[PDB]
Subunit: 811 residues, 2 copies
Amino acid sequence: QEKRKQISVRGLAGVENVTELKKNFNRHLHFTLVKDRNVATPRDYYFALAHTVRDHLVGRWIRTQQHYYEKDPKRIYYLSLEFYMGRTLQNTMVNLALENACDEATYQLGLDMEELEEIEEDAGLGNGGLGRLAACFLDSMATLGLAAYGYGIRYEFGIFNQKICGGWQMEEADDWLRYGNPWEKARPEFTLPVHFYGRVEHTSQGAKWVDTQVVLAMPYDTPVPGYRNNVVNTMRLWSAKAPNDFGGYIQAVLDRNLAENISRVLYPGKELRLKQEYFVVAATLQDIIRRFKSSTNFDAFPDKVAIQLNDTHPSLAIPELMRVLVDLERLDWDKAWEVTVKTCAYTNHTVLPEALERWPVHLLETLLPRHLQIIYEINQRFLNRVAAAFPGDVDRLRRMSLVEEGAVKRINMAHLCIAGSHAVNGVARIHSEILKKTIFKDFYELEPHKFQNKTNGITPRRWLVLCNPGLAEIIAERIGEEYISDLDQLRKLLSYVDDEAFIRDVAKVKQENKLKFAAYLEREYKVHINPNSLFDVQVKRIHEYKRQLLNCLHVITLYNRIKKEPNKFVVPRTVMIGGKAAPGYHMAKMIIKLITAIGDVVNHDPVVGDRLRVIFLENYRVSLAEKVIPAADLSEQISTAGTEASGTGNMKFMLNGALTIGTMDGANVEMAEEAGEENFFIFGMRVEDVDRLDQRGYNAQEYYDRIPELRQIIEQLSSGFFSPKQPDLFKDIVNMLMHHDRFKVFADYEEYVKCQERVSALYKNPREWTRMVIRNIATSGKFSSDRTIAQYAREIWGVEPSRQRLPAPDE
Amino acid sequence: QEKRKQISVRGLAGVENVTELKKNFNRHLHFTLVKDRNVATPRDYYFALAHTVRDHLVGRWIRTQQHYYEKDPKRIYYLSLEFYMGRTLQNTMVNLALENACDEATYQLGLDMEELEEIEEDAGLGNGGLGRLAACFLDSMATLGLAAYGYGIRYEFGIFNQKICGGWQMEEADDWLRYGNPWEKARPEFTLPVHFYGRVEHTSQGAKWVDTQVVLAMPYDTPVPGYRNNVVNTMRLWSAKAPNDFVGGYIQAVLDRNLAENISRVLYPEGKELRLKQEYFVVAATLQDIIRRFKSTNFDAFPDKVAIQLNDTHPSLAIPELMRVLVDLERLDWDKAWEVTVKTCAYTNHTVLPEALERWPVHLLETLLPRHLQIIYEINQRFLNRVAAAFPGDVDRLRRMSLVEEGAVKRINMAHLCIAGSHAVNGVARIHSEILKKTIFKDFYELEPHKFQNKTNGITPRRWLVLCNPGLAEIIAERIGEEYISDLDQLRKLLSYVDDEAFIRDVAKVKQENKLKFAAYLEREYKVHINPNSLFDVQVKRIHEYKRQLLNCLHVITLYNRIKKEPNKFVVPRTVMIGGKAAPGYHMAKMIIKLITAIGDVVNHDPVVGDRLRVIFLENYRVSLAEKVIPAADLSEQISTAGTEASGTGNMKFMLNGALTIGTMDGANVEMAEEAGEENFFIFGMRVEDVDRLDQRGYNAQEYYDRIPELRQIIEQLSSGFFSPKQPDLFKDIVNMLMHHDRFKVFADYEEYVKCQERVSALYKNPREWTRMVIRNIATSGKFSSDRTIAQYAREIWGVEPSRQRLPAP
């Protein structure tokens, strides 16, 4: 029909007028929300603004998907079990240049846009660095015009929010979907069945998977905009529904329950966690193939499809793809295996052979009987390749097998990912080398070409323009706007290091962010802060190996020197530690209680004054990282060498005018390599010194004997200086540090404190200090997720990035 | 603030503008639906259109609510378990005058508005007459300017969709909510807790209800528009959610997730605990919403500013729940709380027989609602004092009037609770309201006459004429104009045109066009030839023994036997249509449906019959189908055994739409025949007084089987296996019932029924006379407008006045 051409996107968005944005706002508040100004809550005004912004999103979104259907590009699929999105309101505005228009429009309507900004809940879809990585990657992928989809699960309750009561961590429900979420769209049209349990019948055709229990997977779509390029991509999240039925008995009420809670909560080996993995994998694959068929010819599949496996969590995508291709599409085993390998690639984030995912076979046999078969067949054929390549070597067969013999039979999912992917990558340079050298050496020796590095990276949008507009603003002045999408050219700033106007500017922006963050702290927890002090922050997930305990040791040392001679001048410091502990982890809960207790002693001690403060930062998450990171002077990256694969907080601090004190570990190695060892506070044992120390054996008592400061704090700790109501409250923190300290806190102590004195020394000197910050920021370019993604694109997926601004919308 | 004035509805898509509707349609497909013309489905285009009509509706909704917050009128609350809403799209467009403009809008966007309308699901909210009555009233109360709210449950899967397989009823789930409901609005911010179980602590200051289980009641708002007056009222429906717990004890809390949630999953229909939970749930969440709204102070101004209509006994707990909130939570003394209650509430009774009335055993009430039981016992004891006062000595009357009834198990008679906690008890038909005073409730009447009343049911002329029969509305509005739509009595003027050739042929023409549309719809599913010239003989009600579709079946087979006996006789061709759902687990009704289709398998494929006779069973009968088959009918079958029907609302639809009525003297039939004139009506069979006489002397089915050789042949056919050749004795329990335990006297009304049908056959043979009679029915039918009914509610019951005045916006 010729008349149907009038059903169009063209006349719709019009433009971004202050008159238009006001119009749509009143329209969304009244027609979409069914409120008016007499009953509107700040939440309702937030929602109205979100909807007014979404309209500009969806317009660019329809056009992008139309573009992809026209152009049939290679489709890239990023599978993650977490997506640490944070907030969307401000990110959408900067990416669509709606920034000032909305600001003005909100002002004319008589509301503070910022008030509305703070009402938005952090997306309850992610947990740690892994989830943040995927969020940065999605932003980069859209910004470089790749046809990319993020696939995962829509958790209703995320992972808890953290309250601190009397120094103790408590966990509450993150009910972030309470009032709904303006950003997502339900797609009941595309609901897909997912199967579980049942049994396999080996009949004439091939294998049939019958008598299964069905869970429905309904998708919700979220737009992911690029940086002012008008390309909008999709995040498709699966939500679980049980089918509706009518039988003499309703014992199958559990059905409904254990079907629903696949989409209820993140973790943490529950049978549940495996159901989550299968669920996301099964729906996503049916969806991919469906989209492939709407161009049957599976030879071109690897030319039109790329599937990334973020860790082993989505590892069942390999047997699943094999299952569909062989059982359903009637393809023969060899041809389908070829398609699978060339389609899939695997990213490892782990440095120890302990974190790596294994599942008992009795589990797989019960819920995924067909997949267990395919896994066995994959194993026998792979072990053939091995036996031909290394005839004789029996030990190799067993070391490389997907099946693992022990007290209990297990499938090693990392060995599955490696056998079924064309590329495997580590996430930082030293990390990828350890993978080759130790963790996966047998596979590397079989297939050297398969193993790559792709150093991690951060998005300059959220982590520079969004969170630090002041700093983005003073840079643009010297070099232009282009760096935002090409971070490599912050290098230009290396000319302005002896320029005086820039030094005072870079120093002014920092102090200002320190002021604004000092204010936000007061206006919530009643906690006095000298905004002139060095801002010492360690924001990480609380673990023994992350070594916030080494931080504590330095803090108490510093406090002791203030008590010994209250008259020696000392560089003032606010020490801020934040991060969630895993429920269960008894040691992490104790570390928090300790930090809060130190604070209680030092922050109320009259002699100390304002020269030293210790604050735990409650409920650390993206939107809070956005606040503290631009406010920091000193970035604590103090993990034992060897324990970090990369890190990411890493790069955020460096991009934001903070100097680093850290170990030669993870991506610090590469950061120090960009800034120059001299523009970095590197200290403590190296990866080689650790290996040396486990060889001759680590006795923590022979550091304890030679250092009277360490001896003193241990005493204060044991006698109950920090818990006068419960002296023995910290006994098992001491026990560990002394007897089973697997992470060598006492070792690195000597050098850590010296290094801290060099820090304090340099900070006495504002100009020199700022000149060092500059040399860090300038040289922060390699760590853009734009660079990371360009490498994934050319080196693994086989697609070319493009920064061409798509036409649209009202064209 | 003055900056804050710019947040207003004023200039937001204001018009009937083919232009702006085309602008908005596009907005919604792309921005609300995230679809486009490449990807879009017929369903998609319908949602875009639904959304376009919605923008204009909510504008008037915002305004009607703003307006209600200063004028502060006496609010009326209609509590109903069912709301039989049907489809919403065109009832909405006709009421705002957007129809013509949307038609044009969609037409120039390369789309056909008729298709789009067929995509919409019937709201899964109601079951039969009681639900539809609630829905007609909501349309009426908005049309007469009243400040009304509908309160009910939002059933996720409603009550089953009906599918016929092998001539057997089967039930499928109705997820009418699968793609969402564009008409409603989630209100998560107004969630209320609802309490179950627990126990009662008597403290010095007052009683406490502690240690309870809690279920959350989430309201959904649906707007209900007035006819062209711009008053848009509210239907608020509660949806049950379980609280989110996040451990040791045990996860039997998983049961109280599910038990919690199927309060809201499905309608009904053992005497379930679940039913009772459903009744308290809607009552409790509703009474909190009322009080709440009444504070955005003392309760002296409560029977004057609030009105609670109980529709049947289902929301009866409102009386004892109101007393709970006022004494326990609000600290009024029992007398001041009682006075507010007995004046706040009014009860509508829909039943004819004493064992149709709701009765909960106490052991059940003691577990689930302990505080309510104490209040009931307290309510009862006082009420009994008044009876012993006003009737000394009479220890024979106390037990008869007690709320506490002493059966095998001890039970609480929920009707007596209703008569005691309300000032007005209303009947639903003039004869019905009288048998309440006469026998069923005499004791209560001989104690409070002033209480009891009649408010004959009505039906909205919007859905049931203008919307379903635009052909008939047109020809009428050509003579007398359009004012009748909101004043159905003006149809009286059509008595003048009874002898007008043009008008006569006009009426016959619409009826004939309605039959052609319907025959086409039919010929599609049920792939059978419909003869559009045959008399359309239709019976649509619940499938029940007393409703008597078995009487109709016997006529059909009589007719059949005659054609096979004398195939060269002229016979007026008939299309016989029977439709209605059978309660699952009511076995006899499942057999009746099987009998109707089995008669169909023979008669519709007998080559000797040709197209003189056809029997169709109308599958999945529901509001939207009702509005297709009603305009197409010639004959309305209203044949319940006399005395069994309080009213009968579908009767009035057929009457309004050009059908003639064959019916016993019962329910709404009486006031129909009285209004139309008796000889304009096909009355047959026993009257109420005639039935008594058969119960006086006994009913024996053999002395009808004996005197009537045609009745005989039919029974021999059923028993012999005529209509069930593969399974000869499939209908044995039907024969047995007819022979030995026919509680409803099918045989007794037979002769008189078939005689009367010949008189229908004879009149249909004279098209001019048939139509003049049809005219006489239509013209005489305004008394059954639910605009009338509602007015007698507002005046004689609620104490508000109807207004036909417009409201502006913006």
